């Protein structure tokens, strides 16, 4: 799901630091889920 969303974001960009930031946000979300 999250990976698919990232792919969609990449497609939007096509038509990356921002991508890295998004990945970091996803990691934070995962950490929150773990908590």
């Amino acid at each position: 799901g999250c990976e698919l969303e990232k792919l969609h974001t990449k497609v939007m960009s096509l038509c990356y630091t921002a991508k890295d930031r998004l990945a970091q946000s996803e990691m934070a979300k995962r950490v929150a889920n773990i908590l």
Binding site: Q24, M27, R30, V31, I34
Partner: protein
């Protein structure tokens, strides 16, 4: 580290050498830990743990 200490310090030095060699093998790519950003910055913190161990051993050698 969790089970017990002391003679594990020399093993932790070997483990730092292993992690440093693995980092040299994988120079441009990042990799994340779970149970995240435990790349190059925390590896510099493990290097600080090694220097703390070296100083403790040198202080220990000056006692006898």
């Amino acid at each position: 580290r969790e089970v017990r200490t002391l003679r594990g310090l020399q093993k932790q030095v070997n483990s730092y050498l292993a992690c440093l060699n693995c980092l040299r093998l994988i120079r441009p790519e990042y990799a994340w830990i779970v149970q995240s950003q435990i790349e190059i910055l925390e590896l510099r913190d493990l290097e600080k743990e090694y220097v703390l161990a070296q100083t403790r051993l040198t202080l220990a050698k000056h006692n006898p």
